[PDB]
Symmetry: D3
Subunit: 259 residues, 6 copies
């Protein structure tokens, strides 16, 4: 199906939200006047054939879940692809964590449990659809609105391996460093988010990429510097260095901590 | 040109067939993204007698028609077999149904009511003429009410023998052709019947019968433009 | 009082003339600030035959009429030339069309349906009579439907302003003698009711004199279109020649007819 | 685990206007005091119950579960001591009959237009038959338009409750076998057939001065096709004959009707 | 079953329970979606097995709370009830707790305007004057029990969480409350404590124990006329403490 | 054009948002529509110039139609006051975004500031072409439409101070002190805002008005983690000589907007 015109005739590109590989834009649809977000994928950097990319995006679009970002339409011209998505208005999960440490307080186990409930439900769903996110972190989790009880929405599903420092590895499972990419790395990254939400600290910090990865590979994270036992138990489960013994998304949901 | 990942059925839910023309269907549709109601005129490329370039350029200009009394064309899509014109929904519907209504109910339409409808029609005509477009096929069934309200605006649809000017039979199709057709519409709206059935028999006010003679003047060259028609005293 | 920096044109976009009376014209408008549709009654102050203070007073009372069956007036503006009454818009249209359409289809309006209309009408009357307003010109052309649904509520429009056949078919006998009281509205409503249920006006003639004298002395035909005895009773009550003995709107509402 | 609202229906709903008095109880235009969204409520008196109230709730729950663009949406059902209140969406169209009568006045509804209504109708029937529901009372007065647009979709209302609660118009649409108390999903096909006939001809296929006259005509008489179906295509008449087949066993299902050539023609 | 209106189905047929917002002393609080409208609501579940009083008094007390129709009180639409629970269905607030704006201010380093706190106190005192004329004592006025309707800087407030603790089973407690004297004046005291907190960023009677705060509350940069109102509202004897309508008439 | 009642007949005054030298600001509900608005009340008695000049400056402000300028719907007037009726912004002042960043010790990215500056300079280009000098640009006179991170900005509070009757001095161009007021002073103020947004500091601080003036007139700001191109634009926008200071349209063409 071809459209008579270009993206500019379909959308008013209002502002650049970011860039990677390709820009992210706040957008208005010309026909309905409805606000959207467009992620532009420059097909230039495609170091893998577009057939495996067209398919991988096709399945991300099929992801229908209240805590996964909604993609409406995917458009393509000669140079680049345009992923048209719903707009989130409540900012990144990172802002809620940063505002917590700045205000000199903590996030409740109850509030965090509820947030993890939405997150793991999303992970359970897209893992069923055989998707691995590969880049889960607070800046890739958005609030739909600005209310305290705003639901969560996972964005920026990882496609980087198909386009080829210290801060990047902070959420990376130890096995990923050996190029073993499995859905179980999502569980690890989710667990790091959880640790971060509950303590205000990251479990494996460092001045370099190597420090982070060696620390995450061999050291158990500090638990002392104020969590409940059932919270720690689930964390110790989600942060098991060995992917084989790390639980799936469905089994995390069945933990005592969500009670 | 821009490619979409999927088909016309991936963008639209086709609800009901409103009609079938000589070169395609007209459907009530729902846009899946927004849940918004549109109508799609499907054009069968098979029935094209002229290279696609000419038919494509003719449509793109129509898409550009932005006037409160012309149908809004939102977007146009294409596959191997069809073109798809996505337009706004009118809930009125046909102006014909207003004539047929008064026709059966005895009384005729107010001169003041018809004056307002002609004003909208001519304002629309003057606009698309300045954009270098001839409609070719104006008739009460190609004019829709936007809603079910008694005071609803009209919207001209279906841009392309009872409404045909004498010039058109000799292949002389020009911007004046629409004026004749509109003059025939105005006659039908005021009298209750068509002017040339099978020179016209005429009751109406003096200032009104003067306009019908002007608009339905048999020579295209002497026929007034829509812009000058709107300057007539019958509107005042 | 307040002044606006501009004109009614800076404030409203006049879309279409809906009609034209003796006092002025009626327009479908759009408010520039909201894009919201209104209808404006323009009143040419030239045609005032009474001091303009009394006209401002009546219109002010009309604006305060807040009821689900009386047209809502939002604001009144005025030029050196005109008064501008800013009203909500009905998608309607007139009640007359509902009657006319029934004659064409040959299908008489059910009492159950007319009961509901009369219930809304009489409620509106009970309310605006409560506020010392006499409409003076009730008839099917002056009652609009809010929307196009079979069950649309009604809105009474065009409260009378005679301070600046046809209407005569709905006129109370005592109005011809220049006795205007809230009772004349009850009469008009009765004529509406009769018209609704029978598809006929009760007092018909070829002259204004013929109509007036029939209204004053003739008893209407109650057997045309079979009416229930309770409907007939109420009609007779509402169409009683003597205003002093004609019931109030509040009283009409308590009739046994509105129980079926 | 019975749930109760603290108050009465009157605390929950303002009753604005009586729409009418149905075969089982009144119908009202209604406003929710909370929202305050418009609804219509059907009030059925439990006095009239012919079966245990537990069983009526079960059968009403099945009707509530019916989710289709051409089936009236029931939001909630409440009860007090005397009444059951069915809370449903408001249609603004209103009755299919009104459109038939208007065509009879103007001179009749075109085959193309009626083809689209029947599509929506039979789709709805295929759906609710698959949910094991028999309507039993299909007729133009029991089919509503959502709005007054020429192209408004329809909504089937007033599903029959005759076996739950204790007319002359319904007789005109009633299949031969239901007179003999054999009531299956095929009786809805007949009724839809009678509606189709009426939409296309402006005439009912079977008329009489008495109930018995109507019954026997429906049972044995072939409709006056030659006189009444003059403007109709042969494939339309073929489908009418199929839907108005006397023996229900040979009558087609809603699914099969939907495969008829008439729908594929125009 | 107390002659209430019967619903065909359960609370799950009416509502999608989306998110748990908190766990109270005798029930939960949920973010909820009404199935029929798709409208968002908040439900307070009350566990009936936790009551220490006949269920009639509970229903009657919630009844008048439901009758509270004011721009600065939380709107209750309906109350439902099964065998185990009551479900208080209320409107959704989206701006968070008043406590947030106080915690956020002291962290940034600045203090809130007199003008801002006055307008907020005006909305609050208007709400009290209203529900006092309806013979309701809140009993638990505090920054976490006052929400902003929306997230705008000029958002109105809604009072939530009217006290009900006594029917079941210190910083804002009036002195007479420690001695079982529960009166509408105690809301006035609480309101005064919130105001002091809004204007200073400190709680007027701060301690680390009940007996520590109870004794200090019993005997212990803001403009003069602001302190004048604070002193009136924080009068130890409820008899000499002004009403809500009286506080409104203050020059501040 | 005259309105029937008074200002309280068409607006409900909900909340007082602030107070100025020549009036107040209120959050308001419109009675007809129920729509939220903001009303700026101008006290007429506090005027220093003829009333006609104020009427006229306000008129052209209302003509300002731009996605990044506060929309004025209408202006009303009684004997005591003028009433500017505006759209509502929900996102708070821009100053709050800067104050919040200093509290988190973090810095507003150049990419975020570039977009913000793009919108602002676009608004400046527009209203400068309409012969309007704002005269009082600063982060408290820039509001966010909504509370979302990516909310557009709306400039409010176009200066009128010299038509009536230090911290505004912090954004005041050197030539404004010498009573030379042109569109160039807006560029300076826009530069000061950009400086504030990028560094978390104001370029010229003073314990008194005299210190701020002299610093702004003769002293260079401390430019030392900004990119060379940011410093280049700041230096240009903060050029002492207005003659050599770039226009808003010129500023839009700068390289800094291209890279971020
Ligand atoms: N659907 C959306 N709705 C609202 N905001 C969004 C949406 N998607 C992304 N954003 C925001 O826009 C983003 C801009 O930067 P970002 O998305 O990090 O760049 P990127 O293209 O992911 N490259 P990198 O930084 O290498 O990951 C973040 O600020 C998101 O919060
Ligand atoms: N934009 C629109 N909104 C609503 N209805 C429309 C629109 N465009 C067309 N229609 C309706 O759909 C049409 C059906 O097809 P159309 O061909 O236009 O009519 P027709 O009587 O079939 N004439 P033809 O097909 O040329 O013989 C008419 O019923 C119109 O009223
Ligand atoms: N609020 C309204 N909404 C929609 N239509 C309206 C409204 N008020 C009036 N109208 C219509 O406009 C009217 C035109 O005037 P009409 O009443 O026909 O002539 P008149 O009564 O003799 N004198 P006047 O109406 O005062 O000009 C009728 O068409 C009404 O149906
Ligand atoms: N969901 C709905 N929305 C709108 N209207 C409805 C709805 N359900 C029913 N109605 C209307 O209310 C019905 C009233 O039932 P009906 O059996 O006609 O009562 P009645 O007054 O006895 N009429 P009749 O039987 O002709 O004498 C019909 O008029 C429907 O058009
Ligand atoms: N109407 C409402 N809209 C939005 N949020 C609400 C509403 N009512 C309550 N909340 C939030 O839900 C609450 C969670 O429960 P909370 O009020 O903290 O405990 P509680 O149930 O009152 N008992 P306690 O723990 O003793 O305070 C707080 O987060 C409120 O901000
Ligand atoms: N259109 C608007 N929408 C939302 N808030 C607004 C709007 N206009 C002004 N405000 C707010 O109201 C203001 C309070 O008054 P303020 O703007 O300080 O008065 P002023 O006219 O600037 N006089 P001064 O501050 O003494 O120079 C600020 O808090 C703004 O954030
Ligand atoms: Ca689209
Ligand atoms: Ca207004
Ligand atoms: Ca409800
Ligand atoms: Mg990202
Ligand atoms: Mg056509
Ligand atoms: Mg009139
Ligand atoms: Mg029925
Ligand atoms: Mg609480
Ligand atoms: Mg200011």
């Amino acid at each position: 199906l071809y459209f008579q015109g270009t993206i500019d005739d379909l959308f008013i590109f209002k502002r650049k939200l970011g860039s990677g590989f390709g820009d992210v834009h706040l957008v208005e649809e010309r026909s309905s006047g409805l606000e959207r977000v467009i992620k532009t994928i420059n097909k230039d950097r495609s170091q893998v054939p577009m057939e495996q990319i067209e398919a991988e995006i096709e399945v991300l679009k099929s992801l229908d879940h209240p805590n996964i970002i909604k993609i409406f339409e995917v458009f393509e011209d000669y140079h680049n692809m345009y992923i048209v998505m719903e707009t989130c208005e409540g900012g990144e999960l990172l802002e809620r964590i940063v505002s917590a440490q700045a205000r000199g307080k903590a996030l409740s186990e109850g509030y965090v449990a509820e947030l993890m409930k939405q997150m793991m439900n999303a992970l359970a769903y897209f893992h069923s659809q055989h998707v691995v996110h590969k880049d889960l972190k607070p800046e890739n989790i958005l609030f739909q609105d600005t209310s305290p009880h705003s639901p969560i929405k996972i964005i920026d599903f990882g496609l980087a391996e198909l386009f080829k420092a210290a801060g990047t590895a902070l959420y990376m499972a130890p096995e990923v460093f050996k190029r073993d990419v499995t859905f179980k790395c999502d569980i690890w990254s989710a667990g790091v988010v959880m640790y971060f939400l509950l303590t205000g600290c990251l479990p494996f910090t460092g001045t370099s990429l190597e420090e982070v990865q060696q620390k995450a590979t061999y050291k158990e994270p500090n638990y002392a510097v104020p969590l409940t036992p059932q919270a720690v138990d689930l964390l110790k489960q989600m942060l098991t260095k060995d992917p084989e013994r790390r639980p799936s998304a469905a089994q995390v949901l069945h933990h005592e901590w969500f009670k």
